[PDB]
Each structure stands twice: as C-alpha cells, then as structure tokens.
From a paper:
The template for transcription is a complex between the viral RNA and the nucleoprotein (NP) that binds to the RNA sugar-phosphate backbone. NP is necessary for RNA elongation by the polymerase. The formation of such complexes results from two coupled activities of the nucleoproteins: RNA binding and self polymerisation. The nucleoproteins of influenza A H1N1 and H5N1 crystallised as trimers and NP of influenza B virus as a tetramer.
We then crystallised the obligate monomeric R416A mutant of NP. Crystals with space group C2221 diffracted to 2.7 Å. Even though the crystals of wt and mutant NP have the same space group, wt NP crystallises as a trimer whereas mutant NP crystallised as a monomer but with 3 molecules in the asymmetric unit; the cell dimensions are different and the positions of the monomers are different from those of the protomers in the trimer. Most of the mutant protein structure is identical to that of the wt, from residue 22 to 385, the rmsd is 1.09 Å for 364 aligned Cα's. From residue 386 onward the structure is different because the exchange domain folds into the groove of its own protomer rather than in the groove of a neighbouring protomer. In the monomeric mutant protein, residues 386–390 form a β-strand (β7) and residues 392–407 form a flexible loop that points towards the RNA binding surface. For trimeric H1N1 the last visible C-terminal residue is 489 and for H5N1 this is residue 496 and in both structures the C-termini point away from the RNA binding surface. However, in the structure of R416A, the chain is visible until the penultimate residue and points into the RNA binding surface, reducing the space for RNA binding and changing the electrostatic characteristics of this surface (compare figures 3C, F and I, blue is positively charged). In the R416A structure, E339 makes hydrogen bonds with R461 and the mutated R416A points towards R461; if the wt monomer structure were the same as the R416A structure there could be a clash between arginines 416 and 461. Therefore, the R416A mutation may both stabilise the monomer and destabilise the trimer. The structure of the monomer can perhaps best be described as self-inhibited in which the exchange domain that is involved in trimer formation takes up equivalent positions on its own core rather than on the core of a neighbouring protomer.
Residue numbers in the entry: 21 to 391, 408 to 498
The structure:
C-alpha cells in the first residue's frame, strides 16, 4: 500500500514542482527570483485562487489584487539596478488552471492545491498571534497552543480538518452557536438543518481528535443539543480547557513552499519514481539540498527569518522548542524573541529599504514523526508550563456540572509520567538515512519550551 502511496504523494509533488518551474518560465524570473520565497507565495496563491471559485476553499482573498473576478495574481519582485522592485501581475484564472493541469499530466491534482494550502496554514501558524480571535470567542488567550490550522480558509474538509487543533474546532463551533444566539431562524428551515448537518460534522471532527472516552462522550452530549446555546458554549470551553492537558490528536504536516519542489524537479529528481512521504527524511533531504532566498526588512535578523520559515516547513510551531532546537542544531527561540516580522510584504511597505537574504533551512539531524511510526522518540507536544496549568484548571468551582465534567477533571489531575496523544520526533544523523541509530536527545533545560511564551507577533486579523 505504501508501496503505491509513496508513489501517489510523489506524483503530487512532481506536479507542484512542474507547475512552479513553468510559472517561472512564464514570468521570466531570474534563478534567484524563482528562489525568492515571496515570489513562491504569490505564485502558490495564484493557482489556489484560480481554483477557489471565490468559495474561500483554498484561500482567503484580500482582494489586494483582483476586482475583475476572471483574473488573479499579486506582487512579484524582481532585482533591477541595485533595487528590489515590486510589480502586480494579473493573469487569467483560466490560463493558470490550464498551466496547472498541464503540469499535472492533465489531472486536477486537488491534493497539490491542498498541500499548498496547508503550507500557507503552517506559515501563518508560525507567524501570527490569534489572541484577539480567542477573546472574541470567549476563549482564554492561554489556549493559543491549541490553535493549529486556525487560519485555514472557512471552507475545506478533505484534508483541511486533520490539521486543525482542538481549539480551532472549539472556536469554530462556538462561532456558530454565538450566531444562533442572534437566531433569526439560524436553526430552522432549509438553512437550519443545512447548518445543523455542518454543526454535526464539526462536532464529529472534534470528537475524533479527542483521545479519551470521557471527553468524546461529552462531545456527543453537545452534538445532540438541539437549539444550541450558552449551555454548550460552556461545555465546549470546558472541553478546550481539558485539551490543554488531555491533549488532542492533531496532524502536523510538513509541507514545503512550491519553489523548493520546483528546484528539486529541475534538478531532475523523480518523486513519483522515488516516492515521497511527509513524515520522515524526505522533507529534510529536500531542505538540505535547497536554496531559498527572502526579502528582508531593515533591522530584521536573517537568522530569525530563517527560523520562521524552517518552523513553518516542518510544521513545528506547536511543538516543544527544545526538541526543535535539538534537531536544528541551533537554538529555536520563542516568537517574542525573534527579530523579524512575517515573510509577506504588505503592499504598503516601502521597496526602497528592502533587501534580500539567504534562508538557512538546514538541520543538524533529521526526524521521523512518531505516534506515522512508533520507535524510541521523545514527546514533541508542548511542556506543562505554569500558564497552561492555570488555564486548564479554572471555572469548575462554577456553574454547570456533570459526571462527564467530574471524570476528565479526575483524569486531568493525575495525567501521567508520559502523557496521552503522543506527538513524537525520532531523531537520526543525516548520515543514517535508513534510520539504523536513534539518537537519544539531550535538551538544554534552560530554554523556553513554548513558541508562544512572551509572544508579540502581529495579530492575524490585520
Ligand atoms: K518578535
């Protein structure tokens, strides 16, 4: 089966690569410019757009370049006369779709679109705080670590779901409910058994991430409300709190930008023939041989920009910094400590003071995602820091109450020498491709374990 799965995924990767190579030819990019990560973004967003049908399935459109709905594109950056120059290209969505399909042996390769969509999601996860979204949902900002895939477009399911975290689901459910509290037949008619079927589906997706019968059970109690309101809200928030301790099973998917794949395909790599898996050496191998540049703002530290992108590539934001640091071979610091802002350049920034720099995306070691395999690894889910504890164990002194609420607290209060939902990394030498010798990591215990400690990133909604 993996016999043909590695092929199937490989096949996808070829397609993104070929697509990218061709888009580079189209736009007449210099080798450097094609390796410019902000150009990679614009090109990815382009193809995503061309297939979105304005559904917000694959992306959210600004619309900072597209009033004419038949057309799509964004800022492309070229090096001219010792200056970085930004131009907005517009293309026919039809034309893009053409090129995309052509790069995919004539297929629709929806998996490729999704792969790019997740890469963006991962990049946003590494970059932007969601503190504001959480309060407006009545959640606790210390739940920031449950907010995987929080930034995925409002329509997706096929593969979108697996990467969303427990908080993201709670937030999405709460948002629905909250709007059944300004009613207007939100729950009656065609519409309100339409949404009622959505709501059901979501609760199930939620339920699935949960890894104890107590919490799943409690989820069912919420699903099978009927006019959902403040009652369920409370239970959900209760549920999110429990997810800080009895954590959910959430897929972390390591998806690289299109330029990396493009470059590998131009280097004659045959992904379909060789196979591809997101879960082990494959993305590490690619990143070791890659050459990606980035635009850089004055007073930003190239190394920090580098961290930001590495993290995103390896989908590592909600993972223990100490593990990341160990695999990278240089300290992976919390976002608050990072002398950089996001990879994308707001259209009002700038170009006069802009520079480019080389991204450092290598790693000292490589790793297999465990419990996806299960040898000797170490927990790569976040540590129990004070603030996680404090947010996990509150308003139960209060209000609502149940046998489901009492179990759960019970499980929480006693929560193991090891811990439920084991997201791992097994770590190997790059000189040990076949994985013959697990390295037992030695963490530096003085490092902060949470990407989100002292966070100060721009808030995502802006
Ligand atoms: K910062």
């Amino acid at each position: 089966n993996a016999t043909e799965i590695r092929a199937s995924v490989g096949k996808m990767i070829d397609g993104i690569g070929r697509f990218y190579i061709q888009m580079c030819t189209e736009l007449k990019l210099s080798d450097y410019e094609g390796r410019l990560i902000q150009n990679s973004l614009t090109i990815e967003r382009m193809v995503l757009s061309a297939f979105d049908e304005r559904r917000n399935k694959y992306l959210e459109e600004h619309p900072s370049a597209g009033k004419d709905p038949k057309k799509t594109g964004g800022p492309i950056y070229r090096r001219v006369d010792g200056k970085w120059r930004r131009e907005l290209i517009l293309y026919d969505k039809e034309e893009i779709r053409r090129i995309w399909r052509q790069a995919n042996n004539g297929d629709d390769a929806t998996a490729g679109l999704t792969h790019m969509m997740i890469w963006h999601s991962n990049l946003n996860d590494a970059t932007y705080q969601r503190t504001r979204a959480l309060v407006r949902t009545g959640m606790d900002p210390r739940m920031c670590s449950l907010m995987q895939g929080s930034t995925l477009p409002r329509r997706s399911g096929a593969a979108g779901a697996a990467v969303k975290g427990v908080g993201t689901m709670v937030m999405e459910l709460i948002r629905m409910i909250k709007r059944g509290i300004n009613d207007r037949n939100f729950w009656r008619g065609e519409n309100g058994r339409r949404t009622r079927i959505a709501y059901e589906r979501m609760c199930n997706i939620l339920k699935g991430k949960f890894q104890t019968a107590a919490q799943r059970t409690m989820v069912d109690q919420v699903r099978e409300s009927r006019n959902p309101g403040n009652a369920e809200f409370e239970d959900l928030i209760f549920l999110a709190r429990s997810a800080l301790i009895l954590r959910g099973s959430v897929a972390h998917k390591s998806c690289l930008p299109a330029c990396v794949y493009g470059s590998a395909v131009a280097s004659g790599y045959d992904f379909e023939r060789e196979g591809y898996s997101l879960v082990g050496i494959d993305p590490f191998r690619l990143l070791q041989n890659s050459q990606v540049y980035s635009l850089i703002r004055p007073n930003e530290n190239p190394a920090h920009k580098s961290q930001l992108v590495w993290m995103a590539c390896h989908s590592a934001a909600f993972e223990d910094l100490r593990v990341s640091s160990f695999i990278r071979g240089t300290k992976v610091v919390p976002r608050g400590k990072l002398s950089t802002r996001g990879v994308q350049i707001a259209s009002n920034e700038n170009m006069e003071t802009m520079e480019s720099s080389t991204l450092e995306l290598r790693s000292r070691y490589w790793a297999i995602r465990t419990r996806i395999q299960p040898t000797f690894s170490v927990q790569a889910n976040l540590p129990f820091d004070r603030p996680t504890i404090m947010a996990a164990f509150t308003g139960n002194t209060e209000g609502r109450t149940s046998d489901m609420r009492t179990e759960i607290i019970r499980l929480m209060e006693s929560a193991r020498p090891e811990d439920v939902s084991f997201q791992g990394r097994g770590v190997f030498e790059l000189s040990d491709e076949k994985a013959t010798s697990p390295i037992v990591p030695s963490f530096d215990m003085s490092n902060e374990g949470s990407y989100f400690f002292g966070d100060n990133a721009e808030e995502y909604d802006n």
